[PDB]
Structures are given as structure tokens and as C-alpha cells.
Amino acid sequence: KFNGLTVLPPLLTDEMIAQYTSALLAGTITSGWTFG
Amino acid sequence: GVSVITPGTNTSNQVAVLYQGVNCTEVPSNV
Ligand SMILES: *[C@@H]1O[C@H](CO)[C@@H](O)[C@H](O)[C@H]1NC(C)=O
Ligand SMILES: *[C@@H]1O[C@H](CO)[C@@H](O)[C@H](O)[C@H]1NC(C)=O
């Protein structure tokens, strides 16, 4: 960190977001539009 | 920065403390 400047981490990691997109993608390959 | 985590004074008066991006060996139980 520099002088009085900091960077805060995001609440969702990249692993969590890749988990979310794989759940969307397995929902659509397998159920069509019914799961939404 | 220092942040204070509280369940709300209408629930309890206990508190937890976050020292942001500080290595936890140079702060000055549960660490
Ligand atoms: C806040 O306090 C009131 C009365 O003391 C109580 O009815 C209410 O449930 C409390 N709220 C919470 C979130 O505990
Ligand atoms: C804090 O310092 C110790 C001592 O060098 C080190 O082992 C530890 O990894 C440091 N903390 C982090 C999060 O790397």
C-alpha cells in the first residue's frame, strides 16, 4: 500500500463467480427455460 | 483501516475487529 491508498477485495471470489456461471449453464443445458 | 463488526446493540454488546490488510502478527483469544 502507498500513502493512505488501499484496495479492498471483492466479496465474491473468482471461484464463486465461476461456480455461479456453471450452475446457470447446467440449468440451461438440462432444463431449458423452466428453472428460471 | 480498522472496522468493527457488531450484531447490533439490541442483540449484544460483543464486538469483533478487522485490521484491514495487516499481517496479524503486528497488530498491537481468537486471532
Ligand atoms: C429490538 O428491541 C426490541 C425491544 O427491546 C425487540 O422487540 C426487537 O426484537 C429487537 N430487535 C432485534 C433485531 O433484536
Ligand atoms: C505474516 O508474517 C509471517 C512471518 O514472516 C509470515 O509467515 C506470514 O505468512 C505473514 N502473513 C501472511 C498473510 O503472509
From Swiss-Prot, chain A:
Effect of substituting residue 3 to K: In strain: Omicron/BA.1
Highest taxon of the lineage: Viruses
Outcome reported for the amino acid change (mutating residue 35 to L): In strain: Eta/B.1.525
Role of this protein: Subunit of the fusion protein that is processed upon entry into the host cell. Mediates fusion of the virion and cellular membranes by functioning as a class I viral fusion protein. Contains a viral fusion peptide that is unmasked after S2 cleavage. This cleavage can occur at the cell membrane by host TMPRSS2 or during endocytosis by host CSTL. In either case, this triggers an extensive and irreversible conformational change that leads to fusion of the viral envelope with the cellular cytoplasmic membrane, releasing viral genomic RNA into the host cell cytoplasm.
Name of the protein in its database record: Spike protein S2'
Natural source organism: Severe acute respiratory syndrome coronavirus 2 (2019-nCoV)
Residues of the full protein shown: 854 to 889 of 1273
